[PDB]
Design an enzyme around this catalytic site. Structure first.
Site, PDB file in Angstrom:
ATOM      1  N   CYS A 184      -0.106   3.470  21.986  1.00 52.62           N
ATOM      2  CA  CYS A 184       0.071   3.494  20.523  1.00 52.62           C
ATOM      3  C   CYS A 184       1.124   2.451  20.103  1.00 52.62           C
ATOM      4  N   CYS A 198      -2.123   1.976  17.790  1.00 50.47           N
ATOM      5  CA  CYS A 198      -1.937   2.349  16.369  1.00 50.47           C
ATOM      6  C   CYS A 198      -0.953   1.395  15.714  1.00 50.47           C
ATOM      7  N   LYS A 231      -2.194  -2.398  15.440  1.00 50.32           N
ATOM      8  CA  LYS A 231      -3.458  -2.366  14.647  1.00 50.32           C
ATOM      9  C   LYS A 231      -3.067  -2.206  13.165  1.00 50.32           C
ATOM     10  N   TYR A 262     -14.445   3.279  16.259  1.00 52.95           N
ATOM     11  CA  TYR A 262     -13.367   3.066  15.267  1.00 52.95           C
ATOM     12  C   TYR A 262     -12.550   1.828  15.672  1.00 52.95           C
ATOM     13  N   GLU A 300     -12.420  -1.320  13.075  1.00 50.92           N
ATOM     14  CA  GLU A 300     -11.042  -1.664  12.606  1.00 50.92           C
ATOM     15  C   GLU A 300     -10.734  -3.107  12.997  1.00 50.92           C
ATOM     16  N   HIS A 319      -2.096  11.585 -12.112  1.00 44.62           N
ATOM     17  CA  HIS A 319      -2.841  10.478 -12.758  1.00 44.62           C
ATOM     18  C   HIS A 319      -1.882   9.317 -12.955  1.00 44.62           C
ATOM     19  N   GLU A 344      -6.600  12.482  -7.173  1.00 36.08           N
ATOM     20  CA  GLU A 344      -6.894  13.448  -8.267  1.00 36.08           C
ATOM     21  C   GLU A 344      -8.414  13.705  -8.372  1.00 36.08           C
TER      22      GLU A 344
HETATM   23  C1  LIG Z   1       4.450   4.584 -21.247  1.00 33.90           C
HETATM   24  C2  LIG Z   1       3.790   5.876 -20.868  1.00 33.90           C
HETATM   25  C3  LIG Z   1       3.424   6.086 -19.561  1.00 33.90           C
HETATM   26  C4  LIG Z   1       2.803   7.288 -19.149  1.00 33.90           C
HETATM   27  N1  LIG Z   1       2.451   7.426 -17.822  1.00 33.90           N
HETATM   28  C5  LIG Z   1       1.844   8.533 -17.475  1.00 33.90           C
HETATM   29  C6  LIG Z   1       1.424   8.701 -16.136  1.00 33.90           C
HETATM   30  O1  LIG Z   1       1.561   7.839 -15.288  1.00 33.90           O
HETATM   31  N2  LIG Z   1       0.789   9.862 -15.808  1.00 33.90           N
HETATM   32  C7  LIG Z   1       0.546  10.833 -16.722  1.00 33.90           C
HETATM   33  O2  LIG Z   1      -0.028  11.853 -16.322  1.00 33.90           O
HETATM   34  N3  LIG Z   1       0.985  10.742 -17.972  1.00 33.90           N
HETATM   35  C8  LIG Z   1       1.574   9.628 -18.353  1.00 33.90           C
HETATM   36  N4  LIG Z   1       1.962   9.473 -19.663  1.00 33.90           N
HETATM   37  C9  LIG Z   1       1.727  10.581 -20.601  1.00 33.90           C
HETATM   38  C10 LIG Z   1       0.358  10.551 -21.208  1.00 33.90           C
HETATM   39  O3  LIG Z   1       0.141   9.294 -21.815  1.00 33.90           O
HETATM   40  C11 LIG Z   1       0.295  11.669 -22.254  1.00 33.90           C
HETATM   41  O4  LIG Z   1       0.861  12.878 -21.698  1.00 33.90           O
HETATM   42  C12 LIG Z   1      -1.118  11.962 -22.746  1.00 33.90           C
HETATM   43  O5  LIG Z   1      -1.791  10.751 -23.082  1.00 33.90           O
HETATM   44  C13 LIG Z   1      -1.085  12.836 -23.968  1.00 33.90           C
HETATM   45  O6  LIG Z   1      -2.427  13.219 -24.334  1.00 33.90           O
HETATM   46  P1  LIG Z   1      -2.604  13.959 -25.731  1.00 33.90           P
HETATM   47  O7  LIG Z   1      -4.002  14.499 -25.839  1.00 33.90           O
HETATM   48  O8  LIG Z   1      -1.446  14.883 -26.002  1.00 33.90           O
HETATM   49  O9  LIG Z   1      -2.364  12.757 -26.752  1.00 33.90           O
HETATM   50  P2  LIG Z   1      -2.535  11.174 -26.775  1.00 33.90           P
HETATM   51  O10 LIG Z   1      -3.140  10.792 -25.458  1.00 33.90           O
HETATM   52  O11 LIG Z   1      -1.264  10.524 -27.231  1.00 33.90           O
HETATM   53  O12 LIG Z   1      -3.610  10.993 -27.934  1.00 33.90           O
HETATM   54  C14 LIG Z   1      -3.410  11.455 -29.286  1.00 33.90           C
HETATM   55  C15 LIG Z   1      -4.288  10.603 -30.168  1.00 33.90           C
HETATM   56  O13 LIG Z   1      -4.337  11.148 -31.517  1.00 33.90           O
HETATM   57  C16 LIG Z   1      -4.088  10.103 -32.438  1.00 33.90           C
HETATM   58  N5  LIG Z   1      -3.678  10.752 -33.689  1.00 33.90           N
HETATM   59  C17 LIG Z   1      -2.417  11.167 -34.070  1.00 33.90           C
HETATM   60  N6  LIG Z   1      -2.422  11.789 -35.230  1.00 33.90           N
HETATM   61  C18 LIG Z   1      -3.756  11.809 -35.623  1.00 33.90           C
HETATM   62  C19 LIG Z   1      -4.419  12.328 -36.763  1.00 33.90           C
HETATM   63  N7  LIG Z   1      -3.797  12.991 -37.728  1.00 33.90           N
HETATM   64  N8  LIG Z   1      -5.772  12.186 -36.833  1.00 33.90           N
HETATM   65  C20 LIG Z   1      -6.379  11.511 -35.844  1.00 33.90           C
HETATM   66  N9  LIG Z   1      -5.862  10.989 -34.725  1.00 33.90           N
HETATM   67  C21 LIG Z   1      -4.534  11.170 -34.675  1.00 33.90           C
HETATM   68  C22 LIG Z   1      -3.116   9.193 -31.685  1.00 33.90           C
HETATM   69  O14 LIG Z   1      -2.995   7.876 -32.163  1.00 33.90           O
HETATM   70  C23 LIG Z   1      -3.820   9.149 -30.326  1.00 33.90           C
HETATM   71  O15 LIG Z   1      -4.900   8.224 -30.399  1.00 33.90           O
HETATM   72  C24 LIG Z   1       2.578   8.306 -20.100  1.00 33.90           C
HETATM   73  C25 LIG Z   1       2.972   8.105 -21.429  1.00 33.90           C
HETATM   74  C26 LIG Z   1       3.548   6.909 -21.837  1.00 33.90           C
HETATM   75  C27 LIG Z   1       3.891   6.719 -23.292  1.00 33.90           C
HETATM   76  C1  LIG Z   2      -6.541  -0.038  19.558  1.00 34.05           C
HETATM   77  C2  LIG Z   2      -6.110   1.409  19.411  1.00 34.05           C
HETATM   78  C3  LIG Z   2      -5.793   1.929  18.174  1.00 34.05           C
HETATM   79  C4  LIG Z   2      -5.401   3.273  18.023  1.00 34.05           C
HETATM   80  N1  LIG Z   2      -5.057   3.717  16.772  1.00 34.05           N
HETATM   81  C5  LIG Z   2      -4.686   4.975  16.639  1.00 34.05           C
HETATM   82  C6  LIG Z   2      -4.350   5.448  15.372  1.00 34.05           C
HETATM   83  O1  LIG Z   2      -4.362   4.725  14.388  1.00 34.05           O
HETATM   84  N2  LIG Z   2      -3.941   6.749  15.252  1.00 34.05           N
HETATM   85  C7  LIG Z   2      -3.879   7.592  16.299  1.00 34.05           C
HETATM   86  O2  LIG Z   2      -3.512   8.774  16.063  1.00 34.05           O
HETATM   87  N3  LIG Z   2      -4.226   7.179  17.545  1.00 34.05           N
HETATM   88  C8  LIG Z   2      -4.608   5.925  17.707  1.00 34.05           C
HETATM   89  N4  LIG Z   2      -4.957   5.451  18.959  1.00 34.05           N
HETATM   90  C9  LIG Z   2      -4.909   6.397  20.097  1.00 34.05           C
HETATM   91  C10 LIG Z   2      -3.595   6.349  20.824  1.00 34.05           C
HETATM   92  O3  LIG Z   2      -3.278   4.981  21.231  1.00 34.05           O
HETATM   93  C11 LIG Z   2      -3.649   7.258  22.056  1.00 34.05           C
HETATM   94  O4  LIG Z   2      -4.390   8.446  21.765  1.00 34.05           O
HETATM   95  C12 LIG Z   2      -2.274   7.690  22.558  1.00 34.05           C
HETATM   96  O5  LIG Z   2      -1.448   6.542  22.807  1.00 34.05           O
HETATM   97  C13 LIG Z   2      -2.416   8.518  23.810  1.00 34.05           C
HETATM   98  O6  LIG Z   2      -1.154   8.580  24.445  1.00 34.05           O
HETATM   99  P1  LIG Z   2      -1.058   9.232  25.877  1.00 34.05           P
HETATM  100  O7  LIG Z   2       0.249   9.956  25.906  1.00 34.05           O
HETATM  101  O8  LIG Z   2      -2.368   9.907  26.213  1.00 34.05           O
HETATM  102  O9  LIG Z   2      -0.847   7.951  26.838  1.00 34.05           O
HETATM  103  P2  LIG Z   2      -0.575   6.394  26.522  1.00 34.05           P
HETATM  104  O10 LIG Z   2       0.100   6.218  25.196  1.00 34.05           O
HETATM  105  O11 LIG Z   2      -1.829   5.591  26.603  1.00 34.05           O
HETATM  106  O12 LIG Z   2       0.458   6.000  27.672  1.00 34.05           O
HETATM  107  C14 LIG Z   2       0.324   6.343  29.053  1.00 34.05           C
HETATM  108  C15 LIG Z   2       1.237   5.421  29.816  1.00 34.05           C
HETATM  109  O13 LIG Z   2       1.109   5.628  31.243  1.00 34.05           O
HETATM  110  C16 LIG Z   2       1.272   4.376  31.878  1.00 34.05           C
HETATM  111  N5  LIG Z   2       0.814   4.581  33.203  1.00 34.05           N
HETATM  112  C17 LIG Z   2      -0.505   4.749  33.625  1.00 34.05           C
HETATM  113  N6  LIG Z   2      -0.579   5.079  34.891  1.00 34.05           N
HETATM  114  C18 LIG Z   2       0.748   5.196  35.295  1.00 34.05           C
HETATM  115  C19 LIG Z   2       1.336   5.539  36.521  1.00 34.05           C
HETATM  116  N7  LIG Z   2       0.619   5.912  37.568  1.00 34.05           N
HETATM  117  N8  LIG Z   2       2.696   5.581  36.593  1.00 34.05           N
HETATM  118  C20 LIG Z   2       3.401   5.212  35.515  1.00 34.05           C
HETATM  119  N9  LIG Z   2       2.954   4.901  34.299  1.00 34.05           N
HETATM  120  C21 LIG Z   2       1.609   4.903  34.263  1.00 34.05           C
HETATM  121  C22 LIG Z   2       0.492   3.435  30.989  1.00 34.05           C
HETATM  122  O14 LIG Z   2       0.839   2.101  31.312  1.00 34.05           O
HETATM  123  C23 LIG Z   2       0.977   3.924  29.620  1.00 34.05           C
HETATM  124  O15 LIG Z   2       2.244   3.364  29.310  1.00 34.05           O
HETATM  125  C24 LIG Z   2      -5.360   4.120  19.143  1.00 34.05           C
HETATM  126  C25 LIG Z   2      -5.703   3.578  20.389  1.00 34.05           C
HETATM  127  C26 LIG Z   2      -6.056   2.253  20.529  1.00 34.05           C
HETATM  128  C27 LIG Z   2      -6.421   1.728  21.891  1.00 34.05           C
END
Ligand SMILES: Cc1cc2nc3c(=O)[nH]c(=O)nc-3n(C[C@H](O)[C@H](O)[C@H](O)COP(=O)(O)OP(=O)(O)OC[C@H]3O[C@@H](n4cnc5c(N)ncnc54)[C@H](O)[C@@H]3O)c2cc1C
Ligand SMILES: Cc1cc2nc3c(=O)[nH]c(=O)nc-3n(C[C@H](O)[C@H](O)[C@H](O)COP(=O)(O)OP(=O)(O)OC[C@H]3O[C@@H](n4cnc5c(N)ncnc54)[C@H](O)[C@@H]3O)c2cc1C
Lengths: 495, 498
Positions: A51, A56, A59, A191, A195, A466, A471
């Protein structure tokens, strides 16, 4: 008492270092062996196992570089950043090598501070309580109450296909190539294959995947095929039902002869066809440690056929080859041996993410495994296919060499959300699936909720964050059964 | 005929359009009013309300542009991509405007297709069953069984500070400025203020936040202060306990005089001090619709003091001003009225994310609200501060103007994970908190798990996805109480490779 050590760990990867440190926590005397046999192409590395060095970690750094390429090509100009860029393979390698070096050192220290004796040598079994290693070319033997095998696998290259072993690279070599791979063939729609092909294509390499049959065998078909659809739309070429039968050096190129009688030249050929457990050097047969037909150790509860000898990680038959499974099995084993614990992993809830150009995260059952287990009629699939808000506003376009008409301009929608639920249990969620950005980040939490017994009602009553993709899981309403369109064309993101 | 309509909705934002489309689903006759009163600076926009036009949507696109800037400055070269880049404010505005225009049109269609009668006019209440609007300069009155108020708020600018109304912009104007804002002052360390300042700084603008007291009032102190620490290390300047007392035009710049007797010129001054409910046009007093001291409608269960008149979204007292809360209240109200539902939102489990340069997602209680409710001794805080793997390998550096020595090169660790648990309930999780990338993506799932009653044990026995930041929630072990270091300096990301 008659043992030099309480615990000897052979292998310093995810499983071994975790078991060893946790054992040492309980005042136990612990030795850990790690030595890196060089790859088929002479590549070697420091402590931390697959690994850290060749899995892992690297890779995921290459994937990050790929996402940066993608963001720069598709998104930067649209979001007001006019950019020109050129990619330099050796710089990315250098950033991987430096970060992995830091981790090699970090783990050496972690063992020393954690009171584990680290020995950089190959160990083998002498008997149920004894392990042998060379030290200045002098065999030494040490004794333990308990021995843990966690030697991991190594890439498998087919011995039957001529030129494969000599001329092909594996995942052991791809992160450290001294030169950029140029035009690349990846064999395997596993895999690792997808990969690897995904980041080489994203990074601008001419990339071809030889897929013997289907992508990501065992994984949900709908999700596996959306990935291949996306990879195709962004420039990866797929030879379906075709594999190499011959690999030759024709001057500076590799001429590959395919099972359909076709021929093609590549600069680099990478086998991602699978991995074999690295157990041949362990002397398992002579000690009585049982192995399966695949060569994996039989230890469904970490305990081998020899009761002083345990095993965890990739070498154990019937468990996923994932790092967190290796780590937690090592920690829980340590506790069961030394702290009176009887806790095992629940293998029903092992989440995974595939880091393809769009990622795929899941826990529990595919549609296929769900239909097979409960029957077609006790299964509902709720799903939605949509675009991330930010991506929707970018208007990402196909490369113009893949355009089929005047309305085929767009990439596929980047996201797919699917719940698989059992009707006879109040729509209990037995399968969660997400294709899209940050799929691992999205799936981690949901995997816990699904493990705690979340129902479709629980998902519908969940308040969304969101704007996110995640989600979407609170407003899924279209069923496969309904046959109605699960596409959403409006760009509110996850809705 | 008793009533012309089943349901009349005043406001076509998140709450109103959701209630209206859901009511119309059940064969009900539905009219929706939306009209945009121009901002203090003459800015106006189409259908969809605050979130679509001047809130979540444009804020998230600006944040994305910021993440792109950051990735190109800090990360691109390290990950092998040698780049030259220049930022063009008007191009980003144009990409926002185009996407929001598509959404204005998409919602007009969605209402017509959904059998909702959309009217682009200001509506007011005549009595418990009647609403009035102008149409070709001719007052019309229409009658309904039910009326829903969802008029939202508008930015608040202090009338007491001279020059503020005349010269300052708000969130209504920032996403559509024809000119780049240049050197900017943001008043308010509210989430809107911090997010706004955060993206303007990431986009290369000289940025200052005037913070009356504390950042993100009501939010967890530890997390709120990590954000400000990060924003400071990346170039946002903070005036603490200082606010404008005077705002004047000196040539094309704005000279701002501060409460501490200091003076400074800015090109743009933006008030993010908060938002007042837009209810003054509604004729609430005369109809008997009760309002709080803040001017918010009293409707703890969506029902006002007048039983035929309902309210949802930002205008209702005692609920979070978030889009998903507006939407779900609108949908559940529609169902209770017309589909025999009796389901209300559980206001104990409303997650939120702040899209600051490092994001902050949470659900449930802060450390402060947890300590207040259960007592200090019934509370454990498990936490870890670390770097994303990819960010760790990039070696992100402070801008050279904030460097003090040869060892203050690094940005703060980008991530902080915290669980707040009750000991007397087998360590039940009552507060989940995550600072770092994709914090909303991480929190959504965990919010559901925490609502289903997840314990610290559940978190520890959870199998990790590696490499992620979210896998950190499976291996948290350091407690505040323990007083031990919760920092990890090694870059395995959220997890451990071993
Ligand atoms: C900068 C910013 C970033 C945000 N980032 C996230 C985020 O990453 N994740 C997240 O979950 N939330 C985020 N939010 C919050 C999210 O935008 C609000 O919680 C959500 O959009 C509110 O939904 P709502 O139905 O209450 O009203 P709004 O989505 O505000 O919609 C109300 C609508 O009614 C209109 N309206 C108002 N009065 C009247 C009326 N009398 N008649 C008709 N239409 C009217 C408004 O203009 C608007 O079009 C963010 C908010 C801001 C400002
Ligand atoms: C290309 C690749 C990508 C992988 N990607 C992932 C991944 O993304 N996620 C994941 O969860 N797993 C991944 N794996 C799997 C992971 O590499 C193995 O499952 C894990 O390393 C197994 O560990 P182990 O303890 O069985 O032995 P190993 O980690 O293989 O080590 C055994 C050791 O024993 C040594 N050895 C052997 N014989 C002797 C001896 N007689 N005396 C002394 N030392 C000895 C070897 O040289 C080695 O150092 C990947 C494997 C490969 C090949």
């Amino acid at each position: 008492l008659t043992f030099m050590y309480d615990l000897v760990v052979i292998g310093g990867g995810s499983g071994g270092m975790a078991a060893a440190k946790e054992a040492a926590k309980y005042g136990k005397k612990v030795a850990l062996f790690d030595f890196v046999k060089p790859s088929t192409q002479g590549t070697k590395w420091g402590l931390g196992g697959t690994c850290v060095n060749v899995g892992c970690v690297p890779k995921k750094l290459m994937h990050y570089s790929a996402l940066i390429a993608s963001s720069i090509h598709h998104d930067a100009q649209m979001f007001g950043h006019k950019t020109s860029s050129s990619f330099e393979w050796g710089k990315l390698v250098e950033t991987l090598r430096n970060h992995i070096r830091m981790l090699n050192f970090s783990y050496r220290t972690g063992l020393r501070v954690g009171n584990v004796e680290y020995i950089n040598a190959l160990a083998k079994l002498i008997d149920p309580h004894s392990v042998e290693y060379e030290d200045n070319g002098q065999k030494k033997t040490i004794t333990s109450r308990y021995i843990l095998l966690a030697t991991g696998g190594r890439p498998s290259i087919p011995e039957t296909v001529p030129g494969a072993i000599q001329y092909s690279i594996t995942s052991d070599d791809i992160f450290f190539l001294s030169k950029s791979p140029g035009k690349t063939l990846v064999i395997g729609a596993s895999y690792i294959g997808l990969e690897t092909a995904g980041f080489l294509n994203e990074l601008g390499f001419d990339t071809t995947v030889a897929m013997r049959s289907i992508p990501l065998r065992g994984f949900d078909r709908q999700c596996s095929e959306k990935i291949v659809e996306y990879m195709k739309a962004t420039g990866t070429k797929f030879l379906v039902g075709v594999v190499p039968i011959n690999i030759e050096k024709v001057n500076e190129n590799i001429k590959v002869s395919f099972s359909d009688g076709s021929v093609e030249e590549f600069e680099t050929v990478l086998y991602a066809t699978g991995r074999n457990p690295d157990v041949k050097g362990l002397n398992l047969n002579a000690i009585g440690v049982e192995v399966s037909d695949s060569g994996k150790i039989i230890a469904p509860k970490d305990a081998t056929s020899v009761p002083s000898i345990f095993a965890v990680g990739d070498i154990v038959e019937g468990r996923p080859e994932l790092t967190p499974v290796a780590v937690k099995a090592g920690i829980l084993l340590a506790r069961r041996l030394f702290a009176g614990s009887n806790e095992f992993i629940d293998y029903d809830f092992v989440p995974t993410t595939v880091f393809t150009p769009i990622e795929y995260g899941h826990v529990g059952l595919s549609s296929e495994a769900a239909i097979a287990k409960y029957g077609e009629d006790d299964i509902e699939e709720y799903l939605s296919e949509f675009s991330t808000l930010e991506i929707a506003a970018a208007h990402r376009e196909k490369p113009e060499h893949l355009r089929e008409n005047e309305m085929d301009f767009a990439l596929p929608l980047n996201c797919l959300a699917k719940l698989v639920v059992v009707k006879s249990q109040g729509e209990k969620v037995v399968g969660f699936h997400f294709v899209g950005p940050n799929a691992g980040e999205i799936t981690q939490g949901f995997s816990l909720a699904v493990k705690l017994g979340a129902t479709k009602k629980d998902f519908d009553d969940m308040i969304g964050i969101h704007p996110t993709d995640a989600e979407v899981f609170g407003i899924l309403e279209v069923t496969k059964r309904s046959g109605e369109s699960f596409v959403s064309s409006g760009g509110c993101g996850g809705g």
